[PDB]
Subunit: 172 residues, 10 copies
């Protein structure tokens, strides 16, 4: 049962970072906020636009001490090819955020974003606080994408509370 006040599910797996394979886990990221967002498939249409947007804006999350990780049920071998593929040919260009592979479906299932019809995940966005605890849960229907600006907004409010202890109003 996925709720904001509880420890986030541990994810572990193989990711593509700077054109190489590295093995990452949620516990590595302690001390930082983590934005973990799922997309349905590699070589899709709406999906690359999101990953590219977050990558181009990665420094916004870096300055905010947040690590953005993009997970999908494709293999690391697709993640790599898709990264090696230039944006004109339909590829990802080269990405500044890790692309995490769930070939086991374990990660998409643990976060409850897994779709039994497709075999691939919905689009979740989960903001995990530095202590490994879930904060925000966003799940979008596949046709409709997310907002880098709203993720930045939320990220800023949660940080505002962990520091000030005042609680954040609407439209913040």
């Amino acid at each position: 049962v996925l709720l904001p006040n509880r420890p986030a599910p541990e994810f572990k797996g193989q990711a593509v970072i700077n054109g190489e394979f590295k093995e990452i886990c949620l516990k590595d990221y302690r001390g930082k906020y983590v934005v973990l967002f799922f997309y349905p498939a590699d070589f899709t249409f709406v999906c690359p636009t999101e990953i590219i947007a977050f990558s181009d804006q990665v420094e916004e999350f870096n300055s905010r001490n947040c690590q953005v990780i993009a997970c999908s049920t494709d293999s690391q071998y697709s993640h790599l090819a898709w990264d090696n593929l230039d944006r004109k040919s339909g590829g990802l260009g080269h990405m500044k955020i890790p692309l995490l592979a769930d070939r086991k479906q374990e990660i998409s299932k643990a976060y409850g974003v897994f779709d039994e019809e497709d075999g691939n995940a919905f689009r979740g966005l989960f903001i995990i606080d530095p202590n490994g605890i879930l904060r925000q849960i966003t799940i979008n229907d596949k046709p409709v994408g997310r907002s880098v600006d709203e993720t930045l907004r939320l990220l800023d409010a949660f940080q505002f509370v962990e520091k000030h202890g005042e609680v954040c109003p609407v439209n913040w």
Copy 2:
């Protein structure tokens, strides 16, 4: 565990406060319209009214978009009413243009997955539901932290665009903006 989009949204029937009166509303009354259903933990709290006041003041932007906004909580109807009739300067809601849905039995909060056993009251979810009663968007916050009337409006525009034009909405998608075909 957590709700999924592209699946029929959980049914809610409840007693609600509309224009200072009690009405019994359900989900199927709003068929033909989108429904933004958003939860808050408690009446006579602080972060809570600021969101409802905002959704209420902006309600015409949802109305023009063929959407109903319904706030729900685990408080009774007489709390919803008392809070409503109280002026905002007294920390009340002022008089409210959006229905306040009382879930006393915890049924609706537990159905949408936003109920937590620690408080006895709801996390703030925001769910967007299509005219056929199908779930589209899911948002849940840790409640120091509130939601955005502009992002709800945005998402609203996006799903309406998809259903209308059969195209899909990219990242950061806006109004009068291009989608992608199939």
Copy 3:
């Protein structure tokens, strides 16, 4: 089914409003004392305040008898305080001399068996608890009909009588009257 006396009363812990402030109270904080715990369905209702007020005005009679009176409802602490802050002229609680216990998790109402699945509201029960936490009297009234402060005190007197004198109290027993010796 429902409770039986001469058995330890169900425990409770929760957020209560006392003198316009929040405080955590539990059944065990009241040990060495009798406890009258009574339930009402909702805040900002009609029959509910009349009872709360009544028990509050008469508090001293419960205090001199070594009893703590505690009102409980499935509303919250925040709903409770807003009610207690209001003027009675405005339909409020005035200001309350007894703790208002928030049942919000619903688990106090269920423990005492007074919980109504239809409205998600508590019925009106009243429970007399001895200084060791034993259950003595049980009353549950249907919602539209309210309770009696003087009958509660009458029963409270009776149980203290049999406690002190080890006697038994006959029907319609009145304060100071002495009962039957089971000697």
Copy 4:
């Protein structure tokens, strides 16, 4: 066991006027019933309660209420207790029915049964004309009930049933109820 629920059914041999007659809860439809329990025949607090209720019977007869006393003793023990005069420690002669539960079925259904004992805790259940439970009182054995509070509770439920109104704290006959 809550109010605004159908009251449990009871059926059994009762002592009425000094004869045995089988009674059931449905017989009393249209009438209010006060069903009250006592632990034992030939004891101390028990007769005083029955006697008081019997002396006051007409006060209930004016409310369209039937009072019934139940316990886990036999009909044969009930009868001999009635035949015994009060000066002898008996019931005198009763204007009220004594319902016997030898099977413990009835005590257990109303949840007043004590398994350390074999006999009932003293409960009082006011049941409305349609067989729907209204009030529930259960006293620990050493402490008996009040005839006068039972009349008070009774007056209130009838006042709600009539005016549709609701009865506040300490409500007695000839007082204003709060409008719905």
Copy 5:
């Protein structure tokens, strides 16, 4: 408990009995060293039951000299038993009984000896002869309308004491003192 069987330890009973107009708590281990004739009756203030109890009480010294305690049991409370005893026989009472009246109000005892009736709430008429070591010997169950035989109860008791002492066995229709069959 389809049926009890002889040559097995008798079911234990501990209860509250009326002995000489007073309440005593007695158990089966208390009478260890002695035989026990334990017999059940359905109800106090009835027809056949007193005639049975009065008859065992009038003949009680025949059992005392045979080193056997007689106990009557029923599902009535100790308070019924005491009122039935204290009542004179003219009124339908018990006179005053020289045997203990055992109250089993929990039905445990009558259920344990198998004589309890579900359609009733009171016991059938059992008669169980129990040897000094707690072993069951004879089992008699009569339908309620028909009563028992104090003289036949005495005959069997005599028989088991003969068997016990002389290591012989008692034939059909065996009368007290007669030689039985060796080995």
Copy 6:
């Protein structure tokens, strides 16, 4: 196993007048039935009882009762015993049916079956014409029963059946009940 309930059914092979016949409880409907068990054929206390009833048959006959003796022995062990002379240690020849239950079904149905040895305890059961049990009597093996008490109880049950009255303690014939 209680007096107010219908009795267990038994169907078995019995020895009636030196021959084998299959009998069952429903045959005896309309008549009273005294069914009693003995542990073993060819023992000391068992025949005394069987003979006692077999000599007394006309008291049961005139009372509309049939007396049947059951045991875990075979019908063949029964018949041999019944061929034997009492002088020889046998049964002589019996006026009452000897019911063989070799399957233990009957003894177990009536709850008198001992698992320590394969022999039944000696019980005695009185069944009214309608198949309803009345008396249960079970004795430890070394101690045998009384024809006179069985006869006494017979009169008692028939009395209450007939006159509607209940029989007091120590009741005998020529006495009025309650």
Copy 7:
């Protein structure tokens, strides 16, 4: 359902009639000796005695062979005695030179699987048990058809051969051969 003969034989313990008095015996008593344990349906029947009489007439042939023949049935020890003490003229056993084992509790016949649930009796079994308690031969016949002392002798001869000489025995193998 059946027990198989590479395996330790089921234990039996009961009351036996030996020499005319009751003795309690078991299967571990006869360790060091071979055992032939055979079952018959009932005492005081026609076909049963002929088998026991025969084997008991053959005793020294089983004795010289270090084997103990044992009869068993579901009858009581008291039926065994009466039958043994009976003359052969009345259908009795005469006085037997082999033990008569009683199974009252039926557990021996059930352990060896010869027990018939239809009648209370057992079929005719024959089980040859080696000195260490292991089962070797299993013979079971329907009631109407009896056994052979010669064949039991042959198998015994063969089973004793195969252990001693370590050679396997062919079909129709006789008192010594090869």
Copy 8:
């Protein structure tokens, strides 16, 4: 397994006079059956029985009895064994059916199968013309059977069948028998 009963059904591939045929217990209805099991093909003691039963087959055929040998070996093992001459350790050419049970069902059904070495003990089961179990013989493996005893047992079961009487101990053919 007890012989008042219906015998367990067997159906399998048998080798009969050089051919593979499917046979079942129901086929031999109307006839007696001697069904005996042996542990292995190309063993020692087994041939001796199979051959002696084969050479003596006319005594069974005149008695209206079919002799069937069953093993857990394949039909292919059987045929080759039956092709092998006796001097060479084979079955010669034998006149009796060899029933092959590969899946162990049959041997398990008659209870002569042991999971130890995975091949059958030697049972011999006599089955009346209606398919009813009559005699059960089970030999430990080292020790073989008797054709002459099986012939005796068979003569007795038929005698009982025809004349309604029984067979005493050591009954021979044309002996008296005991009337019931």
Copy 9:
């Protein structure tokens, strides 16, 4: 998964000659089917097997056999891999259908699914015109298969289906 029984059914998206097509085992009745699995797209040993079966495709077509390659990759990944030039490590444009299992249920039915990684072991299943299984090959991942042995095997089963005669050890074309 024994040879003599009807094969597990598959249904799903495939990339056939640049298009997405829904295929299932029953579509191929009247034809033999070689359904072979590989762990992942954009791997190393995997493309060599597909390209070889694709290059030899006419050998199977004249033998009345359909070759389908299944992976646990998406149809979208299959598409790009086949849009990828061989020199660049892709499939060129390959002449056999690429069957997509996202739900893993095809690889689970045929038994070749690995829990260790989300990828299939390389199985090769030969299925007859009536949908009955014929032969099972399962290779450990690091070692690939042979197009000539599949061709040999396929030839043999067609020989028994035709002549009723049995193919012995090392049987090659038209022996008997």
Copy 10:
């Protein structure tokens, strides 16, 4: 369902015929060596002996490669022996240079999942087991169609190349060829 590779192969222990005498063999005995364990339905069959004879005629190709070939069927040991003894003109096995493993109990065929409940016989499996007892290959043929010694050798070569050189063999790979990193 099915045996998977890169997993420890099921243990087998039985009575086998080697050289014409019985011997007790087991999988663990062969540790340190590669094992090809292959199944056939029956003794005294037609397709079956051809395969057995072929592996026993080719036995040196396997010994050179450090592999023991083992033939298992559901027949007993005495059937294996009589078959091995029978001359090939009578349908016999000639005499075998490879162990004939008897599964009377069916445990082995059931462990390797090649057991056919229909005939009680076994299918034709061929399993390549590595020196550490791990299963690198599963080959199961429908009965009417027999296996290939050369493909078995090819596969054997391949799993040895990958273990030695840590590379991965492509399609159609034979001895002397290169591989991929």
